From a paper:
In the case of hOCT1-metformin in DDM micelles, we successfully delineated structures in three conformations: outward open (hOCT1-M1), outward occluded (hOCT1-M2), and inward occluded (hOCT1-M3), at resolutions ranging from 3.8 to 4.1 Å. The shift from the outward open to the occluded state is characterized by the movement of the extracellular termini of the CTD helices, with the intracellular portions of these helices exhibiting minimal displacement. This results in channel narrowing, as helices TM9, TM10, TM11, TM12 converge towards the cavity, followed by TM7 approaching the central cavity by moving ~ 1.5 Å. During transition from the outward occluded state to the inward occluded state, both the extracellular and intracellular ends of the CTD helices rearrange significantly.
Author numbering: 3 to 47, 124 to 532
């Protein structure tokens, strides 16, 4: 199979390290497509806006349809996510993974370049929809590819280090937003590492599991000897692409074969969609809990962006031995019991508000780090379609429902949204962390996992 030859080969070799840096340079490009609107949505105030830079609000005249503008903008981005979920979930299974990712990166690069010189607001909306759709496809495909590519005992290292790469992408976005004469300079500076990825994407291999599922043993042997020659060692071909006698046709029934696995997979994928929805809603509620500003213009966003590194390092230290479901329970209970304190009286002589908000964030970031890792480890039949469906098709619902509901609630009553978010999160997502599946150090992706699971 793949795990035995991966253990017999260098799982963390130097070629693996340069491929890791290349897909990390992919990972830092996912910051502004999801969170960079805060650096593009400055609203300082015949309408005159006093700011040395500019924004979309300064560019247009958003004084009577300002609420109709940005809400529809982010709703169209999340609709682009909604199309892109099913789109890449079937397209990666159809035309493979690596060529899909390369073409999708090229489309992202040309779409960002054309976004930098957007003529009209209709072009703005269309390009934002296409950008969101493509960028979500790129990031999820890259994360799945490198989760599969690394060996058995080093999945978490890769996953947590790429969440760290996303964090340093937000940090570099905050550092870049200091030099903001127009949004165009920011977008043009962001779009250049995508071309760097395209330039240095000629020396990256495919996914051995998906390639082996195509019964192409020759190119599997080719990529194994390429990996061995890159590390400069003779490969101990114990299996020699044995393929475990796999002959099942790829994409036989994506999400249609779950009827035979109803008592064993339906409840698991349901609780996974529940946990994704809870993470998205709680995350957005904690961002809007101050409305992305608290006495500052950039320091609040840095506090909401540099908080991920302590959570990531805590996860990397913690989840090696205790498992991957107890971290879910600890993170969920900590987030709930941290956000529940804001109902109490504000700190008269201390900083309890920022303390509970930062520890709640830490809990939510530990939860989001894991949700992706356990999703990649699970859905053993085909990790692409089902994994994207649980990842993105129940996060776009959070993106379309969560800001409108909490905005209207904070317009009418502060107490209801925080209480409902805390109750739903704490109770339901702590019940959700009650072993959806048995955890194993190995990472196979065959249907034998679905029918056995140890
Ligand atoms: C990257 N995007 C869109 C997030 N909202 N991240 C998140 N922690 N839910």
């Amino acid at each position: 199979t793949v795990d035995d030859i991966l253990e017999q080969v260098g799982e963390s070799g130097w070629f693996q390290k340069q491929a890791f840096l290349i897909l990390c340079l992919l990972s830092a490009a996912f910051a502004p497509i999801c969170v960079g609107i805060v650096f593009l949505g400055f609203t300082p105030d015949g309408w005159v806006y006093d700011t040395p830079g500019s924004s979309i609000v300064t560019e247009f005249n958003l004084v009577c349809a300002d609420s109709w503008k940005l809400d529809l903008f982010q709703s169209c981005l999340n609709a682009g996510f909604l199309f892109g979920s099913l789109g890449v979930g079937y397209f990666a299974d159809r035309f493979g993974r690596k060529l899909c990712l390369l073409g999708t990166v090229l489309v992202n690069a040309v779409s960002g370049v054309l976004m930098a010189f957007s003529p009209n607001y209709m072009s703005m909306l269309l390009f934002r929809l296409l950008q969101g759709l493509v960028s979500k496809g790129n990031w999820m495909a890259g994360y799945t590819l490198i989760t599969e590519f690394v060996g058995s005992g080093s999945r978490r290292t890769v996953a947590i280090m790429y969440q760290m790469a996303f964090t340093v992408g937000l940090v570099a976005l905050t550092g870049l937003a200091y030099a903001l004469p127009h949004w165009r300079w920011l977008q043009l500076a962001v779009s250049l590492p995508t071309f760097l990825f395209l330039l240095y994407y000629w020396c990256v291999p495919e996914s051995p599991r998906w390639l082996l599922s195509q019964k192409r043993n020759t190119e599997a042997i080719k990529i194994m000897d390429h990996i061995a020659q890159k590390n400069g060692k003779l490969p101990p071909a114990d299996l020699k692409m044995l393929s475990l006698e796999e002959d099942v046709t790829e994409k036989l029934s994506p999400s249609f074969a779950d009827l035979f696995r109803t008592p064993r997979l339906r409840k698991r994928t349901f609780i996974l969609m529940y946990l994704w929805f809870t993470d998205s809603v709680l995350y957005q509620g904690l961002i809007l809990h101050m409305g992305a500003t608290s006495g500052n213009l950039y320091l609040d966003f840095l506090y909401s962006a540099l908080v991920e590194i302590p959570g990531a390092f805590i996860a990397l230290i913690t989840i090696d031995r205790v498992g991957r479901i107890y971290p879910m329970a600890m993170s969920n209970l900590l987030a709930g019991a941290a956000c529940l304190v804001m109902i109490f009286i504000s700190p008269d002589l201390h900083w309890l508000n920022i303390i509970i908000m930062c520890v709640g964030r830490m809990g939510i970031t530990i939860a989001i780090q894991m949700i992706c890792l356990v999703n990649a480890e699970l859905y053993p039949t085909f990790v692409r379609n089902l994994g994207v469906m649980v990842c993105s098709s129940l996060c776009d619902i959070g993106g379309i429902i969560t800001p409108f509901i909490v905005f209207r609630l904070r317009e009418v009553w502060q107490a209801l949204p925080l209480i409902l978010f805390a109750v739903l999160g704490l109770l339901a997502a702590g019940v959700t962390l009650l072993l959806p599946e048995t955890k194993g150090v190995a990472l196979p992706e065959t249907m034998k996992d679905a029918e056995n699971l140890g």
